[PDB]
């Protein structure tokens, strides 16, 4: 979203300065510059780049994630799972609540991501090494005990789920009806909260096997790291609440 404006500006300043557009001496430059402005504007050449990437690709311990399983879930426990983005001095990078509608059991999963460079000092105080994985275990079990305290039964799991087979990914523009809609024999929704939980910002992902106001992921990586065990950030810009 930066360099394309520069190339378009260089092309249009290559265009207008041929005011004698006669006998194809700089009229050729005029024609190729007006043809090169309209073709670089980036959705047709990132179509090319996405084609190269997706046909090319067909052949860590920095972020860690702990997911819990909650069977009788709702958005009613929504604050106590959105507040854990930064408390007890650990700054969880994203919390993700994913729901399965394969049948009637809308199976809900809560994944907590803890980095090792956003809380380097907090983890380095534990021991001389960086015990990231054990600390993610402790943060997951603290959320487990808090949610079992507040009413809804949760269980720490490690073979957690499969929203892709670990099959059609979509993303909506946020907000309450468009997720109430979400066909075929698999249905998935996923919310991801991040960014300073006093003023939190959330991203949305979904899958079936466009519906009302969604948009496909045209070019699949969004399904690839959609498993809550994975360490990713659910690409797409976060919305202001």
């Amino acid at each position: 979203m930066t360099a394309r404006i520069a190339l378009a500006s260089l092309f249009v300043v290559a265009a207008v300065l041929a005011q004698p557009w006669q006998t194809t001496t700089q009229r050729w430059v005029l024609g190729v510059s007006i043809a090169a402005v309209i073709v670089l504007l980036m959705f047709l050449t990132t179509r090319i780049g996405r084609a190269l990437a997706m046909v090319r690709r067909n052949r860590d311990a920095h972020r860690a994630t702990v997911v819990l399983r909650v069977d009788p879930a709702a958005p009613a426990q929504l604050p106590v799972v959105v507040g854990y983005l930064d408390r007890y001095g650990i700054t969880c990078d994203k919390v993700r609540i994913t729901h399965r509608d394969a049948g009637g059991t809308r199976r809900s999963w809560i994944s907590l991501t803890v980095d090792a460079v956003d809380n380097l000092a907090a983890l380095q105080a534990r021991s001389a090494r960086i015990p990231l994985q054990d600390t993610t275990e402790v943060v997951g079990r603290r959320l487990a005990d808090h949610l079992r305290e507040q009413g809804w039964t949760v269980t720490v799991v490690e073979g957690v789920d499969t929203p892709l087979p670990v099959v059609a990914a979509y993303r909506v523009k946020v907000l309450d009806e468009v997720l109430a809609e979400i066909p075929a024999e698999e249905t998935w929704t996923a919310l991801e909260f991040t960014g300073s939980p006093a003023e939190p910002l959330l991203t949305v992902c979904a899958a079936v096997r466009p519906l009302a106001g969604l948009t496909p992921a045209r070019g699949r990586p969004a399904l690839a790291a959609l498993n809550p065990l994975s360490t990713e950030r659910l690409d797409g810009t976060a919305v202001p609440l």
């Binding site: 979203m1 930066t2 360099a3 404006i5 520069a6 500006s9 260089l10 249009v12 300043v13 290559a14 300065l17 311990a61 920095h62 507040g83 930064d86 408390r87 007890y88 001095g89 090792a116 460079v117 380097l120 380095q124 105080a125 001389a128 090494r129 960086i130 990231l132 603290r142 202001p240």
Partner: protein, 427 residues
């Protein structure tokens, strides 16, 4: 009205950090025995990490604790320190000045000798370069290359000996290397003397950056390495291809803005998890170098365009555009020194234009260069005294998008004004 916190008590052996839920609207003198019962002649108190301990009569709600903070268990701070009394005055001179580290020792002498060696290297470079360029005599290049070879051999010999004399010695050893490598093929100070000095600076920077044993002297090496590579390629463009009248600095400011805005992928390119506390600092170190070069070449081209007279007014647009581009990129970086270099780009621009005018024999815009520096110091003072204009939280929601849009439309789309400077499409 119960509030949940996490307390940290580390005095005995290691430490204990546990979550708990304390009933608020109770004075802290009542719930300190609970915290001491769980997680443990001096009484203790909950202190928020980053501050001072609490008055025990004050409760957790009226002291500013939100649900989920981290509180350490510190001491109720101090009292009277039992002050000493002496009545003889010579005894008062010998007693009350002990707590100073006035001890001379064989560790002030090492700092003195290392500082003496650095001063000898720098003033030998200064003397023999002033011997070489003011008169005409090849004793100057001889002595500069001699002290440069001496400091390079002294730098590479103490890599695994003291490791702080080595790194600072290698930082001060690229002034004599740059001064030696600007005298071959003398001429009239020439074009390619800059090229050979740039090659020497980049060579020493790249042989000592990856060869560095530790930090404290990494960021200046990558800063001068990207500076050396950039002015090396632009001196190659100015030495062979075109005569390049006013457009050396044009390619220099383009390279500066390119290095500045595409610094995430660049900084990632220069890159058990036990030594992860090292690497991220080193990684951040590289960023605090590279943006510096993204300032420095951003200076080193903007001083090339508007040094003399008879330039274009579009050059006066593009230097203000370079200033706004390298200053409005400050909010997108998180750390301190990156923001410092980005906000100080325009300061170095003002001082560099003032010194280029005072060499340039003008003295009519040099007062105006000081006026622009006074304007920048004034807006620094206003944004420093009352924290309003330097705090973007009291701003508007489409104003942020409009300001970022104006920034990315000025720093990227200055290339038509670049085509107006070079005459790139008058061809």
């Amino acid at each position: 009205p119960i509030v949940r916190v996490a307390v940290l008590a580390a005095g005995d052996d290691g430490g204990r950090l546990t979550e708990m839920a304390l009933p608020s609207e109770l004075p802290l003198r009542e719930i300190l025995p609970a915290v001491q019962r769980i997680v443990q002649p001096v009484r203790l108190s909950l202190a928020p990490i980053g501050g001072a301990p609490f008055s025990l009569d004050a409760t957790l709600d009226t002291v500013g604790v939100v649900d989920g903070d981290l509180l350490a268990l510190q001491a109720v701070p101090s009292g009277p320190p039992a002050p000493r009394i002496v009545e003889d005055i010579a005894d008062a001179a010998v007693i009350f000045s002990e707590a100073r580290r006035r001890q001379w020792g064989p560790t002030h002498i090492a700092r003195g000798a290392a500082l003496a060696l650095i001063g000898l290297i720098l003033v030998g470079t200064g003397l023999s370069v002033a011997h070489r360029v003011i008169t005409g005599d090849l004793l100057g290049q001889f002595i500069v290359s001699g002290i440069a070879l001496a400091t390079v051999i002294a730098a590479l010999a103490v890599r695994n000996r003291s490791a702080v004399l080595a790194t600072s010695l290698a930082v001060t050893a690229l002034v004599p290397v740059a001064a030696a490598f600007a005298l071959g093929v003398p001429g009239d100070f020439g074009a390619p003397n800059v090229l050979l000095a740039a090659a020497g600076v980049a060579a020493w920077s790249l042989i000592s950056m990856a060869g560095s044993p530790d930090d404290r002297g990494i960021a200046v090496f990558t800063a001068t390495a990207v500076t050396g590579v950039g002015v090396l390629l632009v001196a190659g463009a100015a030495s062979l291809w075109v005569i390049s009248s006013d457009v050396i600095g044009c390619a220099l400011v383009l390279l500066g803005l390119i290095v500045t805005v595409q610094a995430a992928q660049l900084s990632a390119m220069w890159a058990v998890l036990a030594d992860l506390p090292r690497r991220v600092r080193v990684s951040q170190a590289h960023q605090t170098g590279v943006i510096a070069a993204g300032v420095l070449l951003g200076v080193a081209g903007s001083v090339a365009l508007v040094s003399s007279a008879n330039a274009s007014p579009w050059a006066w647009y593009i230097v203000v555009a370079a200033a706004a581009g390298a200053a409005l990129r400050a909010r997108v970086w998180d750390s301190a020194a990156c923001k410092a270099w980005l906000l100080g780009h325009s300061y170095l621009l003002a001082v560099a234009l003032l010194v280029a005018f005072v060499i340039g024999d003008r003295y009519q815009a040099a007062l105006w260069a000081l006026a622009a520096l006074a304007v920048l110091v004034l807006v620094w003072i206003v944004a420093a005294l009352n924290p309003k204009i330097a705090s973007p939280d009291t701003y508007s929601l489409p104003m942020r998008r409009m300001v970022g849009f104006l920034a990315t439309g000025l720093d990227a789309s200055l290339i038509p004004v670049m085509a107006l400077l070079v005459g790139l499409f008058s061809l």
